[PDB]
Amino acid sequence: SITKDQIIEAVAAMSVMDVVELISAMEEKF
Template identity: 70%
Template sequence: MALSKDEILDAIAEMSVMDVVELVSAMEEK
């Protein structure tokens, strides 16, 4: 992965709850 875990966690922390829900849904579809 290009991003480190810390970078991903920082990005998620800045996102809204809905963004996180959409991200999880997108991951489950892959």
């Protein structure tokens, strides 16, 4: 996909957003 369109948001975001999110990025791939 568009890499810059996924860096501008992928350096600036919230907290508990991530806390219920990256216990699972590990799942689709790895």
